[PDB]
Amino acid sequence: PVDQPVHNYMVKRIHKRSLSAAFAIASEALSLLSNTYVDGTEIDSSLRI
Amino acid sequence: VDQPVHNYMVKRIHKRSLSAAFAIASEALSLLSNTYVDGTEIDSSLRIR
């Protein structure tokens, strides 16, 4: 019987699954982010070490 | 949630002993002393042995 030069095109649906990645600690930031080029003159050696 | 990444667990040390002797008799250290009393034909050869 009948048989044709046939074709196949295409219409759609697709998925996804919400994020981040980890660690979490305390208040260093400001806790000594108050300085930055005057105060703290002498001896925080091992501090920045 | 669990709670942060960032500790560095702590540990341990020994001490004590490990012993070993070598016992030299009394009879043994005077014919191990000189006073230059020796040099005198009954100390040098059996000295070697």
Swiss-Prot record, chain A:
Subcellular location field: Virion; Host nucleus
Q: Which domain of life is it from?
A: Viruses
- Protein family membership: Belongs to the herpesviridae major capsid protein family.
State the oligomer form and interacting partners.
Homomultimer. Makes the hexons and eleven out of twelve pentons. Interacts with triplex proteins 1/TRX1 and 2/TRX2; adjacent capsomers are linked together in groups of three by triplexes, heterotrimeric complexes composed of one molecule of TRX1 and two molecules of TRX2. Interacts with scaffold protein; this interaction allows efficient MCP transport to the host nucleus. Interacts with capsid vertex component 2/CVC2. Interacts with the small capsomere-interacting protein/SCP.
What the protein does comes down to: Self-assembles to form an icosahedral capsid with a T=16 symmetry, about 200 nm in diameter, and consisting of 150 hexons and 12 pentons (total of 162 capsomers). Hexons form the edges and faces of the capsid and are each composed of six MCP molecules. In contrast, one penton is found at each of the 12 vertices. Eleven of the pentons are MCP pentamers, while the last vertex is occupied by the portal complex.
Q: Name the chain's protein.
A: Major capsid protein
